[PDB]
Amino acid sequence: GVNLEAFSQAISAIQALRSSVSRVFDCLKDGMRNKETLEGREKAFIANFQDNLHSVNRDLNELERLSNLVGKPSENHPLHNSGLLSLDPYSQLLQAYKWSNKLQYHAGLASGLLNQQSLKRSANPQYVDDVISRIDRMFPEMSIHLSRPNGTSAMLLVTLGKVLKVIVVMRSLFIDRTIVKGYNTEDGKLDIWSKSSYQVFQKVTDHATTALLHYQLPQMPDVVVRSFMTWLRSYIKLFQAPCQRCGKFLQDGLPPTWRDFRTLEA
Partner 1 sequence: PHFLNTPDKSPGDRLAEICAKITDVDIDKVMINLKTEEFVLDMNTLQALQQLLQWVGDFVLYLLVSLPNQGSPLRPGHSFLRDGTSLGMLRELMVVIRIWGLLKPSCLPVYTATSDDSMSLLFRLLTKLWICCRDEGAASPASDGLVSRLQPKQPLRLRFGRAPTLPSSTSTLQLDGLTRAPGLHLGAYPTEECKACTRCGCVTMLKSPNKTTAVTQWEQRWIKNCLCGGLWRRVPLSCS
Q: Which residue's CB is nearer to partner 1, number 31 or number 242?
A: 31
In this complex, which beta carbon is closest to partner 1, that of residue 31 or of residue 161?
Answer: 31
Which helix (H) or strand (E) segment holds residue 227: the answer is helix 221-233
**Given the complex with partner 1, which of 31 and 108 has the nearer CB atom?**
31
Alpha-carbon radius of gyration of the chain = 29
Contact region with partner 1 (CB under 8 A), list: 24-32, 63-71, 192-200, 205-213: 24-32
The sheet carrying 143-146 orders its strands as 143-146, 154-159, 166-170, 176-180
Q: Is 32 in the site for partner 1 (CB under 8 A)?
A: yes
Long-range contact list for 255-264, CB < 8 A, 24+ apart? 255/231, 256/207, 256/210, 256/211, 256/214, 256/231, 258/234, 260/234, 260/235, 263/203
Among 1, 2, 33, 75, binds partner 1 (CB under 8 A): 33
Q: Which of residues 207-236 bind partner 1 (CB under 8 A)?
A: none
HSE-CB at 148 with a 13 A cutoff on CA atoms is 12
Residue 36 or residue 75: which is nearer to partner 1 going by CB?
36
In terms of CB distance, is 30 or 141 closer to partner 1? 30
Q: How big is the site for partner 1, counted in residues (CB under 8 A)?
A: 7
- Closer CB to partner 1, 32 or 190, in the complex: 32
Q: Which of 1, 34, 62, 199 binds partner 1 (CB under 8 A)?
A: 34
Kindly state whether residue 30 participates in binding partner 1, applying the rule CB under 8 A.
yes
Q: How many CB atoms lie within 10 A of CB 213?
A: 10
Residue 239 CA to residue 251 CA, distance in Å, equals 10
Among 12, 15, 19, 31, binds partner 1 (CB under 8 A): 31
Examine residue 44 and tell whether it contacts partner 1 (CB under 8 A): no
Nearest approach in angstroms of CB 27 to partner 1 is 11
- Residue 106: which H helix or E strand, with range? helix 91-113
Residues in contact with partner 1 by CB under 8 A are: 29-35
